[PDB]
Amino acid sequence: CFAKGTNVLMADGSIECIENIEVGNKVMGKDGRPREVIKLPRGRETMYSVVQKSQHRAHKSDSSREVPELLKFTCNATHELVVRTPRSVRRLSRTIKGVEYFEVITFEMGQKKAPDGRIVELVKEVSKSYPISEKAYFEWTIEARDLSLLGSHVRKATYQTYAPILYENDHFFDYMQLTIEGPKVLAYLLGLWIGDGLSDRATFSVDSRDTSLMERVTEYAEKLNLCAEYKNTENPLWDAIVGLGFLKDGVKNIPSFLSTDNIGTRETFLAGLIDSDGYVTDEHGIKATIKTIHTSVRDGLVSLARSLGLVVSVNAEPAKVDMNGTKHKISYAIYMSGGDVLLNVLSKCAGSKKFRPAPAAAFARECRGFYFELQELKEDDYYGITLSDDSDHQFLLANQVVVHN
């Protein structure tokens, strides 16, 4: 069902290639609970490239300059994609009536004759009022080779989903360098460093006019004992930047463990990063925007925000120019949205035009949808794993895409 090299998420929040897994290994399910591998099937056939539909980039190459699509996988022709399509009616409700012929256009389940000879069940767009076998959406499944039978509309309207990482490790807190009264300020000061810090030491660049942030920095430092050194020594903040991985080979980095660790710590780190070089808007829905010239931070942030269940998109931009020179070429804009998922992160920020009050009531981190495009590929060796017949039959790939057995 999957090409050689597909990374899947393991139930303990660990990552492994589709091929290095065996029965007994437990993958990560939708709920943050473990699945059970009870078989490992193989074969060869047409394979398809599934990738999220996006407005730009991605030319074939080995340099991580161009912004990449991380919501992508290669499965086999008979792979069953778990998809959703909206219910939809037009020019009439269920069934209203006027005079002299007019049309009712609807989306409903029917059976279409596959060119191969198979009689597949799928969503069809239907003319005037006709019954014959027809919640705000359809929850269903389709084999890769079958997307092509879909009508233009039904097809553009269909999407896959990704689930949030509701599971939690503790790699952060086991790294003392207690719980209540603590982790908040370091996770905060770490995101603050990746945003404004000096690569060689614990020195950020808090904006003067931002009295509210200067207040935070000084307040927080005090809680972690230090103070004023930033506005390389046995300095437990610099030791964590290094120890916890915030420097991907002499380059600023957002460590993978951040995606399966404590939720609160994920949200606090993001707040510090937004406080440093992000900015929030409310025009058409609450949204935060972090900027970075680092490719490692850019990709680690995308998976960090999606682990929380936020909606993410990335765009390439031009950098700076001092007197028309200084610093060049490109930087990146990462856009995040999600309502109360986002309100829960912004309610930890210090910046005055950044802070937003916390959600009104409790909230749920839903799976988010995404439109994709398929590429019919050549014959190849497939892998795949079988979850127990009594489970939901689903699990999450390393990128969080919800896949079916």
Side-chain angles (χ1 to χ4, degrees), residues 1-131 135-231 233-325 327-405:
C1 287
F2 302 103
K4 190 183 170 171
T6 317
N7 287 237
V8 311
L9 222 221
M10 310 313 300
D12 262 40
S14 333
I15 298 91
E16 183 64 287
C17 291
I18 186 64
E19 58 233 41
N20 309 0
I21 310 169
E22 340 169 53
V23 178
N25 287 180
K26 298 194 284 182
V27 287
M28 183 82 78
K30 308 157 78 78
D31 48 20
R33 313 207 240 296
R35 292 303 130 163
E36 55 303 293
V37 182
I38 75 168
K39 185 192 170 196
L40 330 156
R42 314 304 185 236
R44 170 174 264 252
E45 54 189 299
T46 319
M47 299 294 259
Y48 292 73
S49 202
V50 170
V51 53
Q52 173 175 33
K53 281 182 183 175
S54 71
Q55 248 87 60
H56 47 304
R57 309 185 129 193
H59 105 274
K60 163 74 188 189
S61 78
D62 291 309
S63 44
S64 41
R65 189 176 207 116
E66 255 156 65
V67 313
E69 185 55 68
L70 323 190
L71 281 205
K72 70 187 188 300
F73 72 80
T74 305
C75 68
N76 68 151
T78 60
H79 192 255
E80 284 175 23
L81 312 166
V82 278
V83 290
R84 277 171 179 141
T85 317
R87 253 273 54 239
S88 166
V89 58
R90 169 194 174 197
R91 288 188 29 136
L92 233 84
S93 297
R94 207 227 180 123
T95 20
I96 307 173
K97 300 124 184 188
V99 182
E100 298 282 300
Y101 265 56
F102 34 35
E103 174 152 44
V104 178
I105 305 176
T106 62
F107 274 11
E108 61 184 71
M109 280 279 186
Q111 305 282 338
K112 218 62 200 160
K113 241 289 134 48
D116 1 276
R118 239 107 55 242
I119 2 94
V120 286
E121 200 183 37
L122 76 198
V123 173
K124 311 156 75 191
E125 182 186 338
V126 194
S127 81
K128 295 186 195 66
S129 193
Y130 187 42
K135 211 186 316 111
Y137 52 80
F138 284 114
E139 175 106 76
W140 59 302
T141 239
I142 188 156
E143 285 188 39
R145 50 177 180 182
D146 285 322
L147 273 309
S148 71
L149 321 202
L150 285 185
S152 211
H153 298 163
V154 170
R155 173 57 197 109
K156 281 197 165 285
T158 309
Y159 56 104
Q160 275 184 58
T161 50
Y162 66 94
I165 308 184
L166 303 197
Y167 167 83
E168 301 172 80
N169 285 138
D170 200 70
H171 176 128
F172 204 93
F173 169 56
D174 288 352
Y175 188 104
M176 78 259 104
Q177 187 78 92
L178 45 150
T179 45
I180 283 306
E181 310 167 286
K184 185 139 201 179
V185 308
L186 174 65
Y188 177 89
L189 294 182
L190 288 177
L192 199 47
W193 182 79
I194 282 162
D196 289 318
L198 170 47
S199 299
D200 80 267
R201 54 197 165 206
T203 25
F204 325 102
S205 308
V206 211
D207 175 16
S208 291
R209 51 175 166 93
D210 213 324
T211 305
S212 47
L213 192 51
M214 269 320 318
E215 167 121 34
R216 182 70 163 231
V217 170
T218 304
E219 201 143 73
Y220 272 25
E222 159 238 282
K223 284 207 58 200
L224 219 64
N225 262 236
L226 18 159
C227 208
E229 56 190 58
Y230 36 44
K231 296 148 184 185
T233 73
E234 203 245 27
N235 184 337
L237 184 143
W238 180 251
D239 267 17
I241 299 172
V242 156
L244 287 165
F246 300 85
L247 275 157
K248 195 53 168 186
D249 313 288
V251 114
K252 274 170 173 178
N253 186 60
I254 309 183
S256 240
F257 75 96
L258 249 18
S259 301
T260 49
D261 235 74
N262 183 256
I263 304 306
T265 285
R266 306 184 209 175
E267 299 172 330
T268 307
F269 173 83
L270 274 189
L273 242 187
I274 285 168
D275 264 341
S276 25
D277 219 37
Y279 72 71
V280 1
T281 67
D282 273 24
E283 275 86 67
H284 313 250
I286 179 57
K287 191 140 86 186
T289 295
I290 289 165
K291 296 264 174 304
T292 179
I293 58 151
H294 300 94
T295 293
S296 49
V297 180
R298 167 250 265 155
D299 302 301
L301 170 47
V302 171
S303 93
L304 173 61
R306 282 186 189 139
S307 73
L308 282 163
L310 297 165
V311 178
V312 187
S313 77
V314 194
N315 272 241
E317 279 96 6
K320 302 169 66 170
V321 127
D322 179 12
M323 299 159 115
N324 309 325
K327 194 67 169 192
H328 282 275
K329 200 85 192 202
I330 178 175
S331 78
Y332 308 92
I334 125 81
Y335 307 96
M336 316 176 261
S337 65
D340 294 356
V341 176
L342 185 48
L343 245 37
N344 225 48
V345 164
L346 294 185
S347 54
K348 297 167 174 54
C349 302
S352 55
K353 194 184 175 190
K354 285 161 184 49
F355 169 92
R356 291 300 121 132
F363 64 96
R365 307 168 175 290
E366 315 268 18
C367 295
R368 301 291 188 187
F370 74 93
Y371 297 95
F372 56 96
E373 45 173 22
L374 258 60
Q375 262 281 332
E376 178 187 64
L377 312 190
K378 70 174 183 58
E379 311 306 284
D380 228 341
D381 296 332
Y382 73 67
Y383 299 65
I385 65 189
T386 286
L387 251 49
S388 75
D389 269 17
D390 278 303
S391 80
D392 60 351
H393 308 323
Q394 291 159 91
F395 65 99
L396 270 33
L397 277 177
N399 58 9
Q400 295 168 238
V401 182
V402 173
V403 284
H404 187 273
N405 257 345

